Design a protein around this ligand. Structure first.
Ligand SMILES: [Cl-]
Ligand SMILES: [Cl-]
Ligand SMILES: [Cl-]
Length: 162
C-alpha cells in the first residue's frame, strides 16, 4: 500500500463536479474546487485548473494529474512548515503517510492545530496521540476516515486499509 492508494480509498474518484462532505464543490480524487456556493464558480475553477473548457466533467487522466499535484503540494507543504517538518522527520514510513493524509484533507494550518497530538507523535506515544486526535471536530464529522488514519498512527501498519 502507498499514499496514493490510501488517499484513493479515503477520497474515492468522481469525474463530474460533486459536493464533498462539507458541501463544497470538488472533483476527481478529493480535489476541492471552491468553497463558494456557486456552481458557476466551480466550473470556472475547474476550467482554470485543467486548461480547457470542461463543462464540469474531466477524464480519468485529468483526475490523476490533479491528484499527483495535490499529493506533491501536500508533501512539500509539510517540508516547508516549521511545525510539521520535525514531526515528519521523526516518523517511520507508514506514519508519514498518515500525516500526509491529514494535510491532504485539512490543510497544513488545520493539522498544525493539533498541537498535543503532534507533540505526542514526536515523542512516540502512539496511544496518547490517538486519543488526543480523536477529540476533534475532524473525528466527529468523518469518523470512519479519522479512525482509519488514527489507527495508522497508532500501529504503524496498513491494517486499517486492508
Ligand atoms: Cl491535539
Ligand atoms: Cl471533542
Ligand atoms: Cl468518514
Amino acid at each position: 500500500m502507498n499514499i496514493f492508494e490510501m488517499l484513493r480509498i479515503d477520497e474515492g474518484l468522481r469525474l463530474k463536479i460533486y459536493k464533498d462532505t462539507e458541501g463544497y464543490y470538488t472533483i476527481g480524487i478529493g480535489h476541492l474546487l471552491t468553497k463558494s456556493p456557486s456552481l458557476n464558480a466551480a466550473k470556472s475553477e475547474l476550467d482554470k485548473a485543467i486548461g480547457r473548457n470542461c463543462n464540469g466533467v474531466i477524464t480519468k487522466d485529468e483526475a490523476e494529474k490533479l491528484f499527483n499535484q495535490d499529493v506533491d503540494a501536500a508533501v512539500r507543504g509539510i517540508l516547508r512548515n516549521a511545525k510539521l517538518k520535525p514531526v515528519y522527520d521523526s516518523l517511520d514510513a507508514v506514519r508519514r503517510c498518515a500525516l500526509i493524509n491529514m494535510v491532504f484533507q485539512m490543510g497544513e494550518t488545520g493539522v498544525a492545530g493539533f498541537t498535543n497530538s503532534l507533540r505526542m507523535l514526536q515523542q512516540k506515544r502512539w496511544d496518547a496521540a490517538a486519543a488526543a486526535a480523536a477529540k476533534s471536530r475532524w473525528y466527529n464529522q468523518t469518523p470512519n476516515r479519522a479512525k482509519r488514519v488514527i489507527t495508522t498512527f497508532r500501529t504503524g501498519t496498513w491494517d486499517a486499509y486492508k
